[PDB]
Scaffold this active site. Structure first.
Site, PDB file in Angstrom:
ATOM      1  N   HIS B  53      34.832  63.121  31.017  1.00  0.00           N
ATOM      2  CA  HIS B  53      35.529  62.316  32.007  1.00  0.00           C
ATOM      3  C   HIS B  53      36.907  61.925  31.448  1.00  0.00           C
ATOM      4  O   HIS B  53      37.049  61.681  30.247  1.00  0.00           O
ATOM      5  CB  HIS B  53      34.790  60.990  32.332  1.00  0.00           C
ATOM      6  CG  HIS B  53      33.410  61.145  32.882  1.00  0.00           C
ATOM      7  ND1 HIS B  53      32.301  61.301  32.086  1.00  0.00           N
ATOM      8  CD2 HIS B  53      32.950  61.072  34.157  1.00  0.00           C
ATOM      9  CE1 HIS B  53      31.228  61.384  32.847  1.00  0.00           C
ATOM     10  NE2 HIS B  53      31.596  61.274  34.113  1.00  0.00           N
ATOM     11  N   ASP B  56      36.674  59.046  29.031  1.00  0.00           N
ATOM     12  CA  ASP B  56      36.022  59.269  27.754  1.00  0.00           C
ATOM     13  C   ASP B  56      37.023  59.685  26.679  1.00  0.00           C
ATOM     14  O   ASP B  56      36.841  59.411  25.499  1.00  0.00           O
ATOM     15  CB  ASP B  56      34.980  60.387  27.811  1.00  0.00           C
ATOM     16  CG  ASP B  56      33.880  60.133  28.816  1.00  0.00           C
ATOM     17  OD1 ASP B  56      33.514  58.955  29.073  1.00  0.00           O
ATOM     18  OD2 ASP B  56      33.400  61.161  29.347  1.00  0.00           O
ATOM     19  N   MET B  87      34.361  72.483  31.627  1.00  0.00           N
ATOM     20  CA  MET B  87      34.251  71.628  32.792  1.00  0.00           C
ATOM     21  C   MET B  87      34.857  70.294  32.417  1.00  0.00           C
ATOM     22  O   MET B  87      34.786  69.887  31.261  1.00  0.00           O
ATOM     23  CB  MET B  87      32.791  71.426  33.202  1.00  0.00           C
ATOM     24  CG  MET B  87      32.604  70.480  34.377  1.00  0.00           C
ATOM     25  SD  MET B  87      32.392  68.763  33.948  1.00  0.00           S
ATOM     26  CE  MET B  87      30.639  68.721  33.517  1.00  0.00           C
ATOM     27  N   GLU B 180      28.226  66.940  42.621  1.00  0.00           N
ATOM     28  CA  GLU B 180      26.978  66.580  41.980  1.00  0.00           C
ATOM     29  C   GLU B 180      26.231  65.538  42.798  1.00  0.00           C
ATOM     30  O   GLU B 180      26.686  64.379  42.882  1.00  0.00           O
ATOM     31  CB  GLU B 180      27.249  66.046  40.567  1.00  0.00           C
ATOM     32  CG  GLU B 180      26.020  65.482  39.914  1.00  0.00           C
ATOM     33  CD  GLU B 180      26.209  65.134  38.451  1.00  0.00           C
ATOM     34  OE1 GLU B 180      27.223  65.536  37.846  1.00  0.00           O
ATOM     35  OE2 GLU B 180      25.303  64.449  37.914  1.00  0.00           O
ATOM     36  N   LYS B 182      23.168  62.813  43.924  1.00  0.00           N
ATOM     37  CA  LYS B 182      22.227  61.858  43.311  1.00  0.00           C
ATOM     38  C   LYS B 182      21.732  60.946  44.413  1.00  0.00           C
ATOM     39  O   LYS B 182      22.527  60.604  45.282  1.00  0.00           O
ATOM     40  CB  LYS B 182      22.907  61.033  42.221  1.00  0.00           C
ATOM     41  CG  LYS B 182      21.906  60.202  41.423  1.00  0.00           C
ATOM     42  CD  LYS B 182      22.628  59.329  40.389  1.00  0.00           C
ATOM     43  CE  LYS B 182      21.658  58.632  39.472  1.00  0.00           C
ATOM     44  NZ  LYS B 182      22.408  57.879  38.442  1.00  0.00           N
ATOM     45  N   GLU B 216      21.559  68.220  39.085  1.00  0.00           N
ATOM     46  CA  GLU B 216      20.992  67.700  37.836  1.00  0.00           C
ATOM     47  C   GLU B 216      19.471  67.588  37.957  1.00  0.00           C
ATOM     48  O   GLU B 216      18.962  67.025  38.933  1.00  0.00           O
ATOM     49  CB  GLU B 216      21.561  66.307  37.480  1.00  0.00           C
ATOM     50  CG  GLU B 216      21.052  65.697  36.164  1.00  0.00           C
ATOM     51  CD  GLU B 216      21.727  64.373  35.751  1.00  0.00           C
ATOM     52  OE1 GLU B 216      21.028  63.379  35.466  1.00  0.00           O
ATOM     53  OE2 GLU B 216      22.962  64.338  35.757  1.00  0.00           O
ATOM     54  N   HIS B 219      18.093  64.118  38.845  1.00  0.00           N
ATOM     55  CA  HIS B 219      18.494  63.546  40.123  1.00  0.00           C
ATOM     56  C   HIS B 219      17.610  64.029  41.259  1.00  0.00           C
ATOM     57  O   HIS B 219      17.190  63.227  42.103  1.00  0.00           O
ATOM     58  CB  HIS B 219      19.954  63.853  40.432  1.00  0.00           C
ATOM     59  CG  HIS B 219      20.909  63.164  39.502  1.00  0.00           C
ATOM     60  ND1 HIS B 219      22.268  63.381  39.520  1.00  0.00           N
ATOM     61  CD2 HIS B 219      20.679  62.285  38.493  1.00  0.00           C
ATOM     62  CE1 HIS B 219      22.835  62.646  38.566  1.00  0.00           C
ATOM     63  NE2 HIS B 219      21.889  61.982  37.931  1.00  0.00           N
ATOM     64  N   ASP B 244      23.410  70.718  35.444  1.00  0.00           N
ATOM     65  CA  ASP B 244      23.167  69.672  34.446  1.00  0.00           C
ATOM     66  C   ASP B 244      21.683  69.632  34.076  1.00  0.00           C
ATOM     67  O   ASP B 244      20.846  69.365  34.935  1.00  0.00           O
ATOM     68  CB  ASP B 244      23.529  68.258  34.926  1.00  0.00           C
ATOM     69  CG  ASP B 244      25.026  67.945  34.895  1.00  0.00           C
ATOM     70  OD1 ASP B 244      25.814  68.748  34.351  1.00  0.00           O
ATOM     71  OD2 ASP B 244      25.387  66.876  35.396  1.00  0.00           O
ATOM     72  N   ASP B 254      17.115  56.563  36.661  1.00  0.00           N
ATOM     73  CA  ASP B 254      17.636  57.818  36.064  1.00  0.00           C
ATOM     74  C   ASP B 254      17.467  57.734  34.553  1.00  0.00           C
ATOM     75  O   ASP B 254      18.160  56.968  33.875  1.00  0.00           O
ATOM     76  CB  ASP B 254      19.106  57.917  36.449  1.00  0.00           C
ATOM     77  CG  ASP B 254      19.813  59.238  36.067  1.00  0.00           C
ATOM     78  OD1 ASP B 254      19.206  60.315  35.977  1.00  0.00           O
ATOM     79  OD2 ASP B 254      21.052  59.183  35.900  1.00  0.00           O
ATOM     80  N   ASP B 256      17.600  60.376  32.135  1.00  0.00           N
ATOM     81  CA  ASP B 256      18.462  61.237  31.322  1.00  0.00           C
ATOM     82  C   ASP B 256      17.833  61.561  29.948  1.00  0.00           C
ATOM     83  O   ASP B 256      18.503  61.522  28.907  1.00  0.00           O
ATOM     84  CB  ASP B 256      19.853  60.595  31.172  1.00  0.00           C
ATOM     85  CG  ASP B 256      20.695  60.702  32.450  1.00  0.00           C
ATOM     86  OD1 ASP B 256      20.307  61.420  33.417  1.00  0.00           O
ATOM     87  OD2 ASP B 256      21.752  60.046  32.499  1.00  0.00           O
ATOM     88  N   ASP B 286      23.374  66.863  30.428  1.00  0.00           N
ATOM     89  CA  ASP B 286      23.787  65.496  30.736  1.00  0.00           C
ATOM     90  C   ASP B 286      22.573  64.621  30.375  1.00  0.00           C
ATOM     91  O   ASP B 286      21.674  64.394  31.195  1.00  0.00           O
ATOM     92  CB  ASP B 286      24.197  65.360  32.197  1.00  0.00           C
ATOM     93  CG  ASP B 286      24.767  64.002  32.511  1.00  0.00           C
ATOM     94  OD1 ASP B 286      24.834  63.186  31.585  1.00  0.00           O
ATOM     95  OD2 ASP B 286      25.120  63.744  33.708  1.00  0.00           O
TER      96      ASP B 286
HETATM   97 MG    MG Z   1      25.203  64.589  35.762  1.00  0.00          MG
HETATM   98 MG    MG Z   2      21.216  61.345  35.534  1.00  0.00          MG
END
Ligand code: MG
Ligand code: MG
Ligand code: MG
Ligand code: MG
Ligand code: MG
Ligand code: MG
Ligand code: MG
Ligand code: MG
Lengths: 386, 386, 386, 386
Positions: B53, B56, B87, B180, B182, B216, B219, B244, B254, B256, B286
């Protein structure tokens, strides 16, 4: 108090009030209903019309003679009551031959049979005046990963719907198709599991203008999704051809409770949207009267479907007409959401220093959205407590 | 044992191994990582590249001077290690100004700001060589029904993505967008909640060929959906631009988790599909190393992502190459699923009495599908127990 | 309209209206509130009292001097407003040292520290007049199966609560404990995940009469469970010492919406039960004003909590007082549910041929339960539409 | 490869392999099986014994003559094969008379009938040698809030189980009861919905030592709960009298897949626990072979149940015996979890300054738990990849 008229365009499937109460763990608790009696009783309650699967009206395996007799008696009840038949559909899920699907069965001869059974009932639907033909692929799917190559299955699904579109175009029929999504049950996972997956599939058909969606309240809620949001996306795409109304308490088996049961605030936001967008199609109930009930309770449950819609219509209309609510909508900037972001165009936006270099992020951030006062006004209106 | 090379095209976001462990109920348990160190450590583990991002890499509110210094040090670590940046994406969710969204915020000045922040980072992404630009609209949505008119919001969402497509076409950039989905979190309901809703939205954009999906694992599983099925639909539509990978234990927040954790059989069917379809893009993780872990555990968790993919690749390839499995696939008629239903055409099907009038329904119905033996061969292969 | 008084016994945690809006994906959107100001503003709205975690009132790591100053200023606001403090609790989840739990942390020195931090705050709670001490073990649990041997963990959990019971018995304190269950978040799975698991654990403590439950609406709904049913079981066991009221839309992250939001019909059945059983404890709100809101919206959300309770109280009381509803309850045989099955005893039942040999099963089976008419009367009452 | 013997104590219900494939949307796809043939075929596969509902063995409404003939033919098949009958249960859910429940039906005459039907089958169970009598109250519950006062229902439920305990004590039978929880389906919500609610209810019975739980993998997973955790709590309480093994893919309708299907890692952690705790009861499969299958597939699915248990047993035993795993368990301090927190006692803990005043919180906080390396060793062992 809140009495329906045929002008409200409420419709019921024969299989709804006709459900005998057989579930996976229990035998039937009610006798079979003659479709002629269901037509009469529904007309007495203020319904506008009825819908049917082929096998609800003509018992599977009927001779052309018995078929003709069954249709003629149905026609007569319609003529006697003034009831209409706006939608029909095909049973591609009860008989054992469909245990791995109809249009996406692994066996090719079953897929061909599924298509012929469908086409025969499209002809009947046109004869009875239906405008919409619904397809719910309840057996299209799998319990295990290797049983179904989903790309090949989507090829076969597209092939089936394309052939159906060729058929109605050939015959000159004025009928449109509506695909009904469901995420699971009776298959472990069903193909085209939500409104969104169905809308995306339609755009790959040869004649996409002939196809739309028939979403069901409870089905989207079995995936934990916001049903009014999905309906807004379907309206935005111009694809809400029909809708199935009922109730569901969360992520679990398909309950098919009467409309207004289950998620009551979601039912309020749904009616608000349908009335505000001017949806003009049937308000169809796909529900099951609980098997605890006798026939008096079946008709009480059907009546309650229509009653709850009309109460919510009244409260949603009072909400939107309230000057204090229109003020609060401006306070939360719903008016600014409706205005284009950049009608000045891309170059103007790039050259606009107030959009980035001189944008005060901390001043914008501290602005409250005032959404909790707006939602309490909505609660007060729903509950009749202003 | 199962060692990754840059040829396996494994990628990680800076924000993954960089997650300090702050959750809604707790403070951070790890210090911040310098993106330069993350690049070095990931290259040592066998990764192919990293993603970011804007915020980041360049701390929010940085001067053009500090921005240039941050990019130059990043570039040098890439040149030193051989790591790529396939990406990039935009943070439109952390800063308070985005509390009601970026592209669909009710305030128009915030929407304009969101678009300018995005465009600035597209330029940087192209400079660093990225082929795919991801958009996750984590704040686009609502907690209450009256706060967001979803039709107006979809208009604003389309307007934003169309302007972005005009921008990259104007500049002559070779970059594609990936949306993406979610279903929820951090908003109560998020717009475009699944792969299907995103695929349907893309078909209403002015230049649909520039846009695809970035699904993802976790998600889709937060809606209870079958992730390999959704990925098959995205491949069927030609829209899987990026993916992802991670793990999730069911319908809840979520998680992850590292890839291979959560639903292990779903991870097996996913790898089988990605390898069998020849997906050629990055295998991007991710994930969040649990906040129970110190830095040694962060790198153990990252390594485990790649290890689990390579073990599953091996077992899925052994499954499909097994002659006993190819026999069982024919026994369950997966070969017949791949053959057209009616290449003879509509008229031939209607005239074919073996498709209906002389079709033996009871003989077809009694044919077993043999799916349980097939699925046990798949289990045996997954577990290394043939 | 529906104005609360301190006689309604509504209470709020400092951490509720004090939530600054930091979530897993975003920074805070509101400044910190001084607990003194929260006390004043809540008293103005008609609240009865407030609750606190140790670390809400006394910042972590405070000297005995600063501790004394913080308590004295709080005491003064209570004396100035008339507000009470009926419940307190311990923060065993925010600081990094609790990342694997407090009472069930794998490290023994952390468990000892957790117990000492708790005991210090029990003393303060007694000083401020609290009757109930709540324990929410939000970090007690795991993300992976091998990290936590659950039998050993339950041993350590019992050991902790037994020691706490010894402490208050030693000191002669008139305070009882209430365990608050939650199924997940922030751990992947939390120990004692529902009301039932907590009730069962209490029966294995050395002094079970000192312990009860503190159920939260949203927590039971994160497992898809019927919250009024669980509360009935807790009342039946004599263990409902306290309750947390809020709203939740289904199985997803813990939303902590204001009370009445989320599942509205469940909120109606909850109020009906609490009032009909004569629950006499605080009506406590554990909610979070959405981070979209500024301080005016925080207080609007708090007010709405109390408003919705009072509207539902009125409608539930009208439902139960309606002669037509009392008739329908007899029609569905709720009176017969309350009568013993076999007060005649086991031998009489075995000798009673009308109970089996001469029991007419088909006559009993055909009796309708009339539950759909009863539920529509309940809907009509909830919506103010009789 | 992984062949079961009667020493593995695998058992199946007659209703499992006997399921004809009737679901809520479809007719049966297989003919009925004679219980005599099921006994023979299961003995050939290596099963230890079978279980039954009264109505699986003796058709409802049978004369004492036909009853005797049915039992005698069953007895002979048992004598011929060496198969045992360790558990039996009552069908209180199929016949229409139980549409509002058995023990908690609102009608008192139905409750009395339910008790007499149960007692008659307890006598038969003892005659056939069963040690455990299971009660699954699948119809005890409601679809609407006013239909069932849950406190009165729990009174009637306790009354029923107390009378059953008086009966077996009177007769001198060596049999214990096991309550089987389920959260929903076929009722909208079922009473005693999880293992925890059932354990708590048992502690209010007059003779609690006669009652335990019979948890089912899929049922706890329909609430999103961690099944190995619930089983650990039941073992900790000394109440795991029996267990039902099967597979489930998440929160949805009750799938009853073969054991090892569904959540594979949960199945691994379950076997690890059952073997490590020395559970000595039957390993019973309550599953349904998918209705896609013919009789060859029924027996393949049954065989796969036992195969998957034995593969997981082997991998869990290899995991726990691995010196590198025992080292990692010490690294994550599982040894310290097993040691008492404060065997020194309350006064020592209060006087121990190293527990609070001189406790270094930041040093303890920075210690990693090393749980991700431990979980990857568990993954490697499960997949046969060390
Ligand atoms: Mg993601
Ligand atoms: Mg997630
Ligand atoms: Mg449905
Ligand atoms: Mg429907
Ligand atoms: Mg909560
Ligand atoms: Mg709480
Ligand atoms: Mg089951
Ligand atoms: Mg069972």
């Amino acid at each position: 108090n809140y009495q329906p008229t045929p002008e409200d365009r409420f419709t019921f499937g024969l299989w709804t009030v006709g459900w005998q109460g057989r579930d996976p763990f229990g035998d039937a608790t009610r006798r079979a209903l003659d479709p002629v009696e269901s037509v009469r009783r529904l007309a007495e309650l203020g319904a506008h019309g009825v819908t049917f699967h082929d096998d609800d009206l003509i018992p599977f395996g009927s001779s052309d003679s018995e078929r003709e007799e069954h249709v003629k008696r149905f026609r007569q009840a319609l003529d006697d009551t003034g009831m209409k038949v706006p939608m029909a559909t095909t049973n591609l899920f009860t008989h054992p031959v469909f245990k791995d699907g109809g249009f996406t069965a692994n066996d090719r001869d079953v897929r061909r049979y599924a298509l012929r059974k469908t086409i025969r009932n499209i002809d009947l639907a046109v004869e009875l005046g239906a405008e919409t033909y619904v397809a719910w692929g309840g057996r299209e799917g799998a319990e295990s990963g290797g049983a179904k190559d989903v790309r090949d299955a989507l090829d076969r699904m597209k092939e089936a719907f394309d052939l159906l579109g060729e058929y109605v175009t050939s015959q000159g029929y004025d009928i449109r198709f509506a695909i009904e999504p469901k995420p699971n049950e009776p298959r472990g996972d069903i193909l085209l599991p939500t409104v969104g997956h169905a809308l995306a599939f339609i755009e790959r058909l040869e004649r996409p203008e002939l196809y739309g969606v028939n979403p069901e309240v409870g089905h989207e809620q079995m995936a934990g999704l916001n049903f009014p949001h999905g309906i807004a996306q379907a309206l935005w795409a111009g694809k809400l051809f029909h809708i199935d109304l009922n109730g569901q308490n969360g992520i679990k088996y398909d309950q098919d409770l009467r409309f207004g049961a289950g998620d009551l605030r979601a039912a309020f936001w749904l009616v608000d949207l349908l009335e505000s967008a001017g949806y003009s199609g049937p308000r169809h109930f796909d529900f099951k009267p609980p098997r605890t009930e006798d026939f008096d309770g079946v008709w009480a449950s059907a009546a309650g479907c229509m009653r709850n819609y009309l109460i919510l219509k009244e409260r949603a209309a009072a909400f939107r007409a309230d000057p204090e609510v229109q003020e609060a909508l401006r306070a939360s900037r719903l008016d600014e959401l409706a205005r284009p972001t950049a009608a000045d165009g891309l170059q103007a936006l790039l050259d606009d220093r107030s959009a980035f270099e001189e944008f005060d992020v901390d001043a914008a951030a501290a602005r409250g959205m005032a959404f909790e006062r707006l939602d309490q006004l909505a609660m007060d209106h729903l509950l009749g407590a202003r």
